[PDB]
Amino acid sequence: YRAQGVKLHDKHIEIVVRQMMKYVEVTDPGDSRLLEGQVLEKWDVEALNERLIAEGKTPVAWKPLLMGVTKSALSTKSWLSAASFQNTTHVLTEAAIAGKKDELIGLKENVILGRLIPAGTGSDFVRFTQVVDQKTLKAIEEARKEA
Amino acid sequence: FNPLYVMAQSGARGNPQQIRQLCGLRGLMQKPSGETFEVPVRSSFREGLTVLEYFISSHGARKGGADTALRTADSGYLTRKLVDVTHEIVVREADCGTTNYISVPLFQPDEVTRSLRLRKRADIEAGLYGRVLAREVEVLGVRLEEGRYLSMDDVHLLIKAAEAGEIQEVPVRSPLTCQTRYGVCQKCYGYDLSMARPVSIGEAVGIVAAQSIGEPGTQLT
Amino acid sequence: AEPGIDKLFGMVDSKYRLTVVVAKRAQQLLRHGFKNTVLEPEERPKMQTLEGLFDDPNAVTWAMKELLTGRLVFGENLVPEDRLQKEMERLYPV
Amino acid sequence: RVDYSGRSVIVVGPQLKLHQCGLPKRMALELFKPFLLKKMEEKGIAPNVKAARRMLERQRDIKDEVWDALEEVIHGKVVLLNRAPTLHRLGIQAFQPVLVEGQSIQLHPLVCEAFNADFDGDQMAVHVPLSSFAQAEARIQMLSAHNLLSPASGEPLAKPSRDIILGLYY
Amino acid sequence: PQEKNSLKDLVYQAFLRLGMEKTARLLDALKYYGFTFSTTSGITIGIDDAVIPEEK
Amino acid sequence: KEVRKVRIALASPEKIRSWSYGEVEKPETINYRTLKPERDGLFDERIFGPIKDYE
Amino acid sequence: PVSLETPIGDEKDSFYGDFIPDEHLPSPVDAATQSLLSEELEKALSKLSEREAMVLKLRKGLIDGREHTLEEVGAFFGVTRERIRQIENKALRKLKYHESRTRKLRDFLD
Amino acid sequence: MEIKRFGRIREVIPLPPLTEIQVESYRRALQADVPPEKRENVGIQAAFRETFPIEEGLVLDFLEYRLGEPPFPQDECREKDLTYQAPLYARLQLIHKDTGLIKEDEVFLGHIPLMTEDGSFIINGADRVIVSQIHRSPGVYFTPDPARPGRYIASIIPLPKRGPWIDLEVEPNGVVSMKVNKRKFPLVLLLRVLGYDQETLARELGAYGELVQGLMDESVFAMRPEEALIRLFTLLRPGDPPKRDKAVAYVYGLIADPRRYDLGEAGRYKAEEKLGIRLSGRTLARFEDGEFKDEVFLPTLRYLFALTAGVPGHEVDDIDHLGNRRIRTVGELMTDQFRVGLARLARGVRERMLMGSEDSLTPAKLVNSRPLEAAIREFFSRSQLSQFKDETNPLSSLRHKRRISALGPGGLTRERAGFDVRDVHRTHYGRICPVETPEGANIGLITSLAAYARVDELGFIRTPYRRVVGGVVTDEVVYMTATEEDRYTIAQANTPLEGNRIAAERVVARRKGEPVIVSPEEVEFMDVSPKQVFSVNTNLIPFLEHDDANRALMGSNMQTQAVPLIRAQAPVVMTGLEERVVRDSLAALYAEEDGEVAKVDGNRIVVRYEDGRLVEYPLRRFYRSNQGTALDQRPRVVVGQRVRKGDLLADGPASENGFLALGQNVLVAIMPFDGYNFEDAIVISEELLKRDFYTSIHIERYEIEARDTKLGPERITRDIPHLSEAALRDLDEEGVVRIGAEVKPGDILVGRTSFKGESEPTPEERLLRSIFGEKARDVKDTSLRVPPGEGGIVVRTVRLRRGDPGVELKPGVREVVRVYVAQKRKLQVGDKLANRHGNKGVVAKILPVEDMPHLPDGTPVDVILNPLGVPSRMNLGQILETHLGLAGYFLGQRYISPIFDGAKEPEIKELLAQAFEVYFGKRKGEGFGVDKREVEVLRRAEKLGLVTPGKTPEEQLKELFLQGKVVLYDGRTGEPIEGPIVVGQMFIMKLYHMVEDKMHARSTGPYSLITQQPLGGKAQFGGQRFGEMEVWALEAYGAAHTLQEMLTLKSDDIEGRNAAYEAIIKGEDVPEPSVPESFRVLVKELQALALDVQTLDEKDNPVDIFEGLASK
DNA sequence: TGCATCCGTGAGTAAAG
DNA sequence: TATAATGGGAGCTGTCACGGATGCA
Ligand SMILES: Nc1ccn([C@@H]2O[C@H](COP(=O)(O)CP(=O)(O)OP(=O)(O)O)[C@@H](O)[C@H]2O)c(=O)n1
């Protein structure tokens, strides 16, 4: 990008690279239900290791995994996103055998259902905000003040 | 005040090589095999090319047209892949509370392997502008506090400090080290670059990343 | 640019919260025939028709100009939703 | 595919303000048609909605006052302009529509770069955000005059270019 | 002489110091006067403007 | 209620029969003269439902 | 018959079925015109008394979907079939007068 | 006016017939004028000879064919939506071998489409063009192996769908393999089947690096030809019972059957030339005296081993050399489809021969002509190369007829086309134009035949050169292939000659494309003209040598898009090709012999020739083309005119006195103008609309059918329910709009009533009926109205009814009505202009004349182009044109400047000096001195270094005028433009992309069947596509509600869209949406795949999005 | 434990068609 | 409702790169 004179912030490349490093490979299951060579999200294996250490058990030995952008997108948890991406019959057969539930965390899944995406004005952080004039606000504070 | 000169100098139109083809010579040309013709086009567009010169050039013209044609599809495919990996990444909270960070280097090893020399201004800007410092920095009698959003002036100051030998790398919150699940926090992301101020919780940051990497894709030669 | 947009972004912690507040206030105005406006007669946004200046019909213009005054309160969990709806229907019918 | 949408050839229109575009009258009549039927009934232009629709069905039936009614419909409202390819988010931007005779959309000069638009025949699409929510989103978040810096680099994106730079330099 | 880079820096500085409303007004003003002046400046292209240098 | 998840899973023959309103026994679509659906064919109104509302 | 997935044009871009509009489902204009018709009919029926409005709604099918005979409406209200026919007639006459006066239902007759 | 022309190159030969590729290809393939006995074994005759005889016992043999006369002439076919075609009869004879009985008959096989005089076709009433296809020529090739360097692949390629590709390869284990139908087996086996013995192969291949030992297998020579043949059949047919006659049949059909295997005659010749051998037929082997005899295999193996060892005189082949790519023209493509139809007919023939009462079997009882008819009809209606003819202007049709495609049946799939195919090969020189190709996906795959190029009988493109003997340039011209061309040193066409002798010591020439400086002794040939390197379109660009190729491409292509203008003009600067293009395109009309003109009319010209005969040429007047542009011929002679042979009688569309007239000559000022010409936009003067410059006539066709229904007939009627006389004003008695009416959007053109669908009126309908006491009519208004944003003047109505003479419609329809609507389109804001140099832009502003920059003498300019469009694009040619145009404005003359051989700067300066005298000495005589503003501009120019200081005002203005620049006054202020401005005459065309055709908008409208989403396209009143990337745009903004609207309320949330429309017409805020219907379709299409998809809540309890309507 | 080899899959947007 | 009849034709081809499963030595 610099060679072509394109100014572009590292933030964006970092977001993508972060998704490229999303998964990890098991090297020793420890006291877990996992298998050697199994692949899973780094967040999930860290949560499991904290739950096993808090339980006094042996943690899961794991190794960092780098996958390219296509395989990272196909390996994501939401089966709606993965099936709408690419390799639809493969995504769908594995998800249906596994009885996957798509929790609708992302944007594609919610777009497919026509739901309101979890971003912008759709963020839980802002969409529950209320507005009221001081006239009506005092008229309601009086009703709360009577009972 | 020559019109070609003014237009090129101001940034309104034209670059030196086009003006050269108009006034100087057209230059060396490529064969279809990518190998160059030993004989250049000595004519400018003002003088007019010969039939043979024109034909010799049409190879490179067609090669560049086919290059652009085959490149737009690969860029679009890349952008769609980037959108599919990043789309759930949103600014979901104000601070994940991580203590991890990355250190943007201000120097890079010379290709001579001789010493370390300062990185290019634009490169440090694209690495630092609008980021939150993960640690106190004290340079040139100034305190850049932990938690500060690096303004462009903050960046030029850090470049000055590096030029004065006072700092080699800057610690900075980054999405590489953020710990927000399904997304990223506000301090780790930094500026909404489009507003020169901290990002608003709720920004579809992953989509913006994909579009920022993809949109210049068809300019990559 | 929207009149006073920089101050409006100054009001909220997230730009999207400004949008949610403005849109909810605009719907409040449309539902209650603008009878609940916190604007004095001179602060009313006007529209220059062929006849003369008339009330701006655009509830969003109204909501932004109201927001700019300070006479509006916004936040999360200020009141139960049905209490708000019924109190507004009491003070300003349909 | 989507409703309340149109498309036409684009044309420069340098007299516009940054938050503005030129929308042809006929496009606007169709894109805002339900609003226009309602507003026609509000004034005296038709007894009801169905009479207003029958009145707009034929072109020789359409009278001057309806156009004035259209101006009251769109007042303060914005429309989305889009140019394909939509390479990044500034491929869609929101504008306050200024009605025009003629059949070409007028596009402000300072946004051409972000759209990668020139006037060698390009065409853009128009979309009408319907609800108060969508209209507030368009006016706050997607308005041209609020999106001046690049989300990718942070550098100005709407900025002087060819003739503007030329005259200032001169 | 104001050119592409210096005008870009003007827009960015104006943004930081004055807000997007005033910067949008600034941009429209720049557009107005740039167009006006470029009209009457005398800028054109004839073949004798592609000046072949003697050193060639 | 509000949709929050979407599950996908294999369907048992019993589940597939629970979905079905009738077995399609004839490979026939519509009658060449009436232009109405054929009985026990791919368009039978007995299986899939009325062509006209409430009729 | 012909295939709905017949190719149009020389790419793999469009199907022949993509240009076939659905005639079955009512258009938003159609649904809205039906809604405004029902609301204007209730508007004009509120200018009658409750009985003549109910007799009209029973005899034309706006209540339970079907039209009743004069004998059924007369047995329901407890009157003779001639009386129920007469109050239907006077209800229609009042509706005709109100319509000539206000013209609020003409445009729906196409 | 006077036509001064430049140029010093005399062109020995003229341009060949420009449509000869099309016309001659089809003539050769049909042989309709050849008496049957004299026909050659080519074309459809060769197809007949291939299919016949038909055996097994009965035999059906082919004697001859004949083509009758067309049932209807070309115009009648265009009107009646018929195909212009000839009946095809074939004379056949049946023979029973044992009986000896011989029954003979001429059977009718259907029709074959005939090609019109200009090289086009008329299929179902619409003109179509069959585009020539480029492909790899058949033959034997040797390419490098991309894995193993020192190894090479031998490939043996027959005609498309005339046999299998065969590869020979030297494996890592040393044995020589043969790949056929994707099966690798040792070649030694097939060599044995050919009757070769180890002695002969040893003495033929022993010389090469011991490589022949990789061919030595003992188990193969241990068996005779029959055992090796059965071994090969087993190796090629796993599971098939290896019978003897079965194996002989399979191998013969695979390698020696001229009815299954066919190298081209070109493949034959090229194999002969490459391997240095001679071929008997067009197959790799033969069946002679019961055994198989080799033709090609051993020569190929010998060449392969020789190239592998490295012995000289053996080279790998360049497969993009135009000596290895050939053209499949109209005749060859149609012949292939004919051959396929014939094969199907023969299958049916044998089918009927096996059964049936064999006592009474005639030729008529055995031939079902339907498969042949279907194959031809398919080729001409739905082939990738059968394209809707481009007749926007005559140059459009010419270019379309001369285009070469690498796509289509038997060609390349896109995305399977790398850089190599799309490159301009060195051998393209003189054969395929290097600039006329599309920008975008098809670049380098659709190209154009160069202007002097011809395609020979073998299908290779040939270009002409002059013979050069001892530095003397003959007039003997030789058309070469690229293979032939590579043998010679060929000088450039501009090399200076005194008489016929090369007058230069050093000469610029080519050797295998490589440029080289050479002495006249070494020169063997010389180019005919610069014109021979480029296409016809590119040859229409004056000053092409000053234009970057990327923009020449655009100007070249955009001439095809020029709209015929009612006042069209030829350019004031021409290339000298503008007349040939009008003549060859059959646009204009010409005199057949010397004669005197008897009658002249708006409709017809009658000529008395030297034979005393009276010939009447009718004129085509206001006819609608495929693209809706008007095609009318106007007469250009007068009563009593003497005309010689070939003199102009009538100007076609876009012709001015026989010169190609694609646009207007306008007066241009090259300066910015207040942003209204920012970024390629154009500013024009209202004076152009005033004098009807850039005004064009356009005709649209509207059509409606009335058919029989199971509910009663449709009928065209004036009796349409619920309509006033205001709505029926311009409808005639029968219901069709009257010729001459002005129709606007919404106006009825043809009344029609349709019986209502079976419907119980909703109780609301019943009560409204009772209130208004009016029966619902049986029928409903289904009339054909004017679509949004269209209209004009009715000029024709056609009505066809069932039961009328000569008329028969398709089953069911009672009557068909067509209405032709004309419209005169003035230029408007949004329309597209362009010049021949790639400068294109959309009219953005039309100023009144008093705002237009004007010359001191009061003359305002026509259009204002922005100078910022030039430097980045490097199309300086439009500048020189403008300069020359300036001179022509005041001298009152036009010019011919051949490309690369045209007007140079000094001669343009001479002309400009003369013009300045006409422009300024007039002023000095009329009694006016230099103006004060002129002095101010002269001061400014003096500071710019444009004029010398100390000269007089007149001298300095003359200096500027010599630079092409003049003083220009702002119309709005009267103050001068501070600098002198380049003003001059430019040729500018109005392109087919007019905004009237493109502006579209929709609130609500038709929805699709399954998806319940809006239809697409202006014709369907469709909605815009808000695709994946538009969704990303809305997401990145965080416009959750705008996006959700797009996904629900505006597309396919049925309840949502209805409720939104109702809320808006009532004045309420739009309701919250619900599920989009296409997601329900997704759920049901997954259920159809045995996948249970379940919408749950946070308690993992199912949610029914179908509202119970599908749960029992 | 490592390589060759084969099969499946994907390869830009809007427009018109 | 009755001579006897007993194993098929069409392939069709200028990418391309990757990723992952199979196949050999
Ligand atoms: N197949 C296609 C054809 C067109 N387009 C779109 O149309 C424009 C063509 O650029 P362009 O070639 O017109 C830029 P030009 O004006 O010539 O030069 P400049 O840089 O000095 O301004 C691109 O920006 C694309 O977004 C596409 O996406 N795919």
Ligand SMILES: [Mg+2]
């Ligand atoms: Mg463009």
Ligand SMILES: [Zn+2]
């Ligand atoms: Zn964080």
